[PDB]
Design a binder for this molecule. Sequence first.
Ligand SMILES: *[C@@H]1O[C@H](CO)[C@@H](O)[C@H](O)[C@H]1NC(C)=O
Ligand SMILES: *[C@@H]1O[C@H](CO)[C@@H](O)[C@H](O)[C@H]1NC(C)=O
Lengths: 36, 31
Amino acid sequence: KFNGLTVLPPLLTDEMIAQYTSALLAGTITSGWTFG
Amino acid sequence: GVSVITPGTNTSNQVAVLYQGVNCTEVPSNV
Ligand SMILES: *[C@@H]1O[C@H](CO)[C@@H](O)[C@H](O)[C@H]1NC(C)=O
Ligand SMILES: *[C@@H]1O[C@H](CO)[C@@H](O)[C@H](O)[C@H]1NC(C)=O
């Protein structure tokens, strides 16, 4: 960190977001539009 | 920065403390 400047981490990691997109993608390959 | 985590004074008066991006060996139980 520099002088009085900091960077805060995001609440969702990249692993969590890749988990979310794989759940969307397995929902659509397998159920069509019914799961939404 | 220092942040204070509280369940709300209408629930309890206990508190937890976050020292942001500080290595936890140079702060000055549960660490
Ligand atoms: C806040 O306090 C009131 C009365 O003391 C109580 O009815 C209410 O449930 C409390 N709220 C919470 C979130 O505990
Ligand atoms: C804090 O310092 C110790 C001592 O060098 C080190 O082992 C530890 O990894 C440091 N903390 C982090 C999060 O790397």
